[PDB]
Amino acid sequence: TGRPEWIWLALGTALMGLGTLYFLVKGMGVSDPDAKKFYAITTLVPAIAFTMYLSMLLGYGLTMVPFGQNPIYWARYADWLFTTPLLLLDLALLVDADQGTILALVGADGIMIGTGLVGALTKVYSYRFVWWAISTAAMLYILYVLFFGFSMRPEVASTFKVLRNVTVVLWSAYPVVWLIGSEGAGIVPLNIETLLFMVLDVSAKVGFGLILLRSRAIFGEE
Amino acid sequence: TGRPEWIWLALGTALMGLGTLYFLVKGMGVSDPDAKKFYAITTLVPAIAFTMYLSMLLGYGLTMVPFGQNPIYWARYADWLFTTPLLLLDLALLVDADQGTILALVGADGIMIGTGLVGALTKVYSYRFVWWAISTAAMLYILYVLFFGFSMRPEVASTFKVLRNVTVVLWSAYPVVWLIGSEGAGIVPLNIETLLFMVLDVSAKVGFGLILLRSRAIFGEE
Amino acid sequence: TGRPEWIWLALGTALMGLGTLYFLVKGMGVSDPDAKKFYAITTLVPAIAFTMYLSMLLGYGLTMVPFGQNPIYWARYADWLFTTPLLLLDLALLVDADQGTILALVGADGIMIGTGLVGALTKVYSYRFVWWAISTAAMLYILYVLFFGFSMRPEVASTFKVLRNVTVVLWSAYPVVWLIGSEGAGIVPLNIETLLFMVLDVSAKVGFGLILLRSRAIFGEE
Ligand SMILES: *C/C=C(C)/C=C/C=C(C)/C=C/C1=C(C)CCCC1(C)C
Ligand SMILES: *C/C=C(C)/C=C/C=C(C)/C=C/C1=C(C)CCCC1(C)C
């Protein structure tokens, strides 16, 4: 509690935990294989985030990087490495995407997160932003595929449309927060940055899942 | 050989190596695609464990963690990260599990191992057990799915029943050994802990594989 | 630019980048799901390599290992961990390989790279070569499967034959370069070793992809 941002890490942990438990209870008794995939994917997402928010709260998921002793929460990338592709899989399964398109998405996502991590830990200040730029190019490619790389059922199309729009908006904020926060230019304090990421993460995982798991799009059509 | 536990790391290495070679020879000439998956999965398991037991023997897979300079063999988690999901896949393929259920299993398993590793390396003593608890919750979820989340063929059902029972028993010992050994309360010396893990690992990988690969459950039914 | 090998890391970065962009443009408008998989796989390969060549150029992907202060470019293994299995998947998809065989290949490849990395970072000089030997055994197993573990269409068979022959030749050079270069016996300077790896990598990723993506083997047969 010596670090001002502890409050948002604590709240983040609690909200991911509760979301995980909610999705877990909700998924009880589901027999439809299609719906099972969506529950499995959607429940794992906040469960993973829970563990990484906890690691940050307890101080395990924090390291000091010298550029310009900067506190970098590296645990976010461990979280994102797994949760972002899973979120993309939810969208991909919804629309019955070709395997080729899933691979494209998952691979671009690995690059986005991997280069983001490299940027986060880079000791030469100017180079951090080179990695930011490549990571953003990978994000833009993902956004492109989501709008132009590909829903047959009307309920599938409408849910996909919503979750896709939710994704483009929230995901796009991440590079901006990084850029202006402690990993980037340092204009916004780590405390506020942590709050922004918490709001983003919770919306993109728990908000996302609520929207998805309450839709009948997740069941094969009697 | 300056570390008393070297003998069990040496034996572990030899037993995983021989098991790998046995499974490799045995799988020669197998043409049935189903049986091929089982051999591939079951042979990779001890092959991976071989490499990580070797890394521990030679001292690469050991680090010192300050809490309470504690010797932590981190290589176990590198091994388990890959071998535990593969073992779960063997069981899952056997019963023709839905993809949703496989994802649930694999994901819960990643969490179990990942939080186990975080626990192993955590520098605040009390917090190590928080991570132990979350990892155990993930294990219990796996055990639950194995008994209640789902075999049609009688030979499939019987083999599955055996391998499942083998799994519940041996896997459950792992958290207990951790808790009382050098990663946890330090009641049992690293030397004995290493022996216990060796016996467990060899039974859960080589014993498991022997049981599976001698069964006709692994072939599609003339 | 203080390190003589910077020139080859710079060229490597440029060539992977251009190859990525070429494959990206070329894959535009492709609707055939089969062809989509090949483009996705084949474009991701140099894209990944691009990022890791960049990391090496900027000095992030380099560490000092004490044996015999040896400069080890660890980023190569981060690259190879993902790009080698993807290259094997290209070959595997081409021939419609059984899932069992894909798993065998991917798993053996993970072992090859993982033990290679362990070897690269090992502090006891003699032991480095133990890891080299195990990694090579895994490579030889891959080479075996590629020739004896399994093409129906004549265009599929011919393209596969070429890409397979390209693979056996180039991949086999890697262990030799390691052995004689800075990770191994230190007979050939890091500068020359980096050049050799650059030529190899570019041929095995961009040369490979050119050959594959210009073939009609990648489309399902009007
Ligand atoms: C649950 C977490 C989510 C949905 C996280 C999404 C994160 C991103 C889309 C991050 C993107 C970034 C870049 C595009 C540039 C570099 C910094 C990153 C990693 C924040
Ligand atoms: C071949 C290796 C096997 C089957 C290993 C299984 C290991 C576990 C089930 C470990 C479980 C653990 C917990 C449940 C709590 C924390 C400590 C661990 C990682 C030993």
Ligand SMILES: *C/C=C(C)/C=C/C=C(C)/C=C/C1=C(C)CCCC1(C)C
């Ligand atoms: C694009 C990169 C490619 C195709 C890299 C292939 C690399 C190898 C086949 C490396 C093999 C190695 C061994 C067999 C022994 C130890 C050293 C390695 C990792 C270079």
